[PDB]
Amino acid sequence: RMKQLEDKVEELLSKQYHLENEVARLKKLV
Amino acid sequence: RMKQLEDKVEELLSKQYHLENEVARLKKLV
């Protein structure tokens, strides 16, 4: 079922952006 | 197309994991 899969993608993809910038923030401090 | 959507979710989990590992590494770092 497409929309849920489609939904899960848009879901994962946003967590990815938030983790990515976290690291980035962490690298400075360290 | 479904199998495409399916593969995208799977590829995104692998990125996510790598990411959490890193953020962890970076955490100890503090």
DSSP letter string, A1-30: -HHHHHHHHHHHHHHHHHHHHHHHHHHHH-
Could you tell me the residue range of the domain that residue B20 belongs to? 1-30
List B residues 1-30 in contact with A (Cβ-Cβ < 8 A): 1-2, 5-6, 8-9, 12-13, 15-16, 19-20, 22-23, 26-27, 29-30
Determined by which method? X-ray
Phi, psi angle pair for A12, to nearest 5°: -65, -45
In chain B, beta strands by DSSP E = none
In one letter, which amino acid is A14? S
How many domains are there within chain A? 1
Residues in chain B: 30
- d(C-alpha A26, C-alpha B5), whole Å: 32
Pair A12, B16: CB distance under 8 Å: yes
Asked if B30 lies within 8 A of A27 by C-beta distance, the reply is no
